[PDB]
Amino acid sequence: APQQINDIVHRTITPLIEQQKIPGMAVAVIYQGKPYYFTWGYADIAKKQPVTQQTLFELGSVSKTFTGVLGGDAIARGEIKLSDPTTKYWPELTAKQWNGITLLHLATYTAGGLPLQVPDEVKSSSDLLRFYQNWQPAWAPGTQRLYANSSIGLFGALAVKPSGLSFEQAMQTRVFQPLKLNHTWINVPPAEEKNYAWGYREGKAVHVSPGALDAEAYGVKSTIEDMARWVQSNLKPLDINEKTLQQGIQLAQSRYWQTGDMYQGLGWEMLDWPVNPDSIINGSDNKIALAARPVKAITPPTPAVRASWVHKTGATGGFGSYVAFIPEKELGIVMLANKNYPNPARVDAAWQILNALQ
Ligand SMILES: O=C(O)[C@@H]1CCCCCC[C@@H]1NS(=O)(=O)N1CCCC1
């Protein structure tokens, strides 16, 4: 890599790893469209396995960007409409609070207070139906944003229903394979387990547990190389040959709602570039990112703005990830770690790197 990129990345990430006691980390910088890779530390402390460019990390909520794009692709295919009522794809959802709740509301956390987590008690499909039937909204649809796995998770499950494919099969054939993300998985195959990093929580090696709607809300594992390719694809969707996928990427970066200085896409979240770093850094703390906040509808949604800071944080019990990119500058970053360390530390490091390069 250019010594500029090397010095900028190392001077930022080295203190971050020491301050946060991160066992292993991989970083990709996309600069003028090309990726540059950096790795540190251990994928498996006990077996002394280093992080490499082939190490798989749990993406956590960064998975929601894949779900948003897969949904965008289903829209582009004409299989679903974001204006469709939820009940069009789940007719068994007969309880009256669902009147007026559309797929858009599910995709953007604005259905009226769906909870952050699906209860652990829920497992079978009938458990899930019962949960949603019994759920009582605190707010009318489209008035408040409350970040929720039970919201975008249901969107992902419903979005693939007309295709007849399972969510995993749809993701594989319509997103992963066209983009040549050949080391990106919802379920890690036995052949790839050698590369699956352990996560570390209170010093214990952990992997994400199965849960309802896990594939759709937090289920993807990927390498730093595939994630850099994911950033490149979202930076320049028009270079993608599959038409509905190119269109779906664009739909996921449209601005549907505004709260404060941030705009809600499908999975992706966006701010106008240049950004106030304190806005994205402090805004990434869970104190703000998970709070109930009033939203203004963007009527109609703004198409993908090239002069945006587009990003998503993600975590599981043992992992912490961040992706941010600026289409106007052909500039982006992926940070994958096998510890869940605080969101503001992620965004601060990413902004330092990208600001120095733009
Ligand atoms: O990634 C995140 O940013 C979310 C933030 C929501 C509140 C904190 C928990 C972390 C969470 N991860 S998760 O919701 O995707 N998923 C839940 C079970 C395992 C991982």
Side-chain angles (χ1 to χ4, degrees), residues 1-18 20 22-33 35-95 97-120 122-201 203 205-238 240 244-260 262-275 277 279-286 288-295 297-358:
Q3 193 170 17
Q4 194 213 160
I5 297 181
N6 174 91
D7 289 339
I8 284 156
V9 168
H10 280 286
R11 288 169 189 166
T12 301
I13 299 298
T14 290
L16 176 69
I17 286 171
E18 309 198 9
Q20 303 293 336
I22 293 167
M25 188 149 191
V27 171
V29 169
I30 293 77
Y31 181 78
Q32 296 174 10
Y36 302 92
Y37 301 110
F38 305 85
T39 50
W40 300 257
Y42 286 89
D44 184 335
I45 291 167
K47 295 186 173 181
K48 301 175 181 300
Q49 300 302 301
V51 172
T52 77
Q53 296 175 196
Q54 294 76 34
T55 299
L56 293 163
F57 296 79
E58 291 172 7
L59 300 183
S61 288
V62 173
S63 304
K64 296 172 171 67
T65 67
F66 292 94
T67 301
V69 170
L70 183 61
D73 174 85
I75 301 163
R77 286 168 183 265
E79 294 175 343
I80 65 166
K81 296 197 274 87
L82 286 174
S83 55
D84 285 334
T86 301
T87 53
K88 179 168 179 178
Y89 304 98
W90 205 0
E92 296 63 32
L93 214 55
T94 61
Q97 70 273 21
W98 288 93
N99 293 333
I101 296 176
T102 64
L103 293 186
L104 173 68
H105 298 130
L106 297 181
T108 58
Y109 324 118
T110 52
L114 282 169
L116 175 58
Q117 302 293 348
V118 182
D120 197 61
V122 170
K123 277 151 298 170
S124 46
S125 74
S126 73
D127 278 348
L128 252 202
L129 176 58
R130 202 151 44 231
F131 164 67
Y132 284 111
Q133 282 281 72
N134 286 332
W135 164 75
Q136 293 308 124
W139 315 294
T143 62
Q144 297 227 44
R145 177 190 184 274
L146 178 60
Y147 186 79
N149 291 331
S150 70
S151 188
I152 190 174
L154 179 57
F155 169 74
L158 297 183
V160 300
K161 289 295 193 232
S163 81
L165 304 168
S166 71
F167 184 81
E168 179 180 31
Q169 187 67 258
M171 188 68 75
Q172 287 168 332
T173 63
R174 300 180 167 189
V175 179
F176 292 168
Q177 280 164 28
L179 299 181
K180 302 188 193 303
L181 315 180
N182 302 135
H183 297 87
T184 299
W185 314 101
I186 286 163
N187 298 109
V188 176
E192 316 292 330
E193 286 177 10
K194 63 193 180 142
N195 285 312
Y196 190 6
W198 285 97
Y200 289 92
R201 172 182 52 141
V206 295
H207 279 155
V208 62
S209 291
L213 299 176
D214 57 0
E216 295 85 349
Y218 52 88
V220 181
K221 300 94 203 184
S222 192
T223 70
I224 197 70
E225 290 186 355
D226 276 12
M227 287 308 293
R229 195 159 176 87
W230 181 236
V231 170
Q232 288 175 318
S233 305
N234 281 271
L235 269 166
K236 282 77 157 199
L238 268 160
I240 291 147
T244 59
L245 182 56
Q246 159 189 128
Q247 192 172 341
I249 287 160
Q250 291 170 305
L251 294 172
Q253 282 177 57
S254 297
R255 301 166 171 211
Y256 297 90
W257 309 93
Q258 179 170 14
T259 166
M262 64 89 37
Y263 301 90
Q264 183 65 56
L266 313 179
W268 294 112
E269 301 163 14
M270 290 85 52
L271 296 88
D272 282 314
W273 176 262
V275 291
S279 189
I280 53 181
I281 294 165
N282 301 328
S284 73
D285 197 304
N286 280 339
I288 291 189
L290 307 177
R293 289 300 177 84
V295 284
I298 307 298
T299 307
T302 311
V305 178
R306 282 181 58 80
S308 312
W309 176 280
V310 188
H311 72 159
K312 186 76 188 74
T313 62
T316 64
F319 291 81
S321 62
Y322 185 62
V323 176
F325 59 92
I326 307 163
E328 184 77 275
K329 305 294 194 169
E330 311 170 78
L331 192 59
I333 188 171
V334 183
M335 305 163 54
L336 310 177
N338 59 352
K339 182 179 201 286
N340 177 10
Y341 65 104
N343 285 337
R346 311 186 204 168
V347 185
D348 197 347
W351 187 84
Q352 288 294 358
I353 288 164
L354 295 195
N355 189 46
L357 294 176
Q358 45 87 33

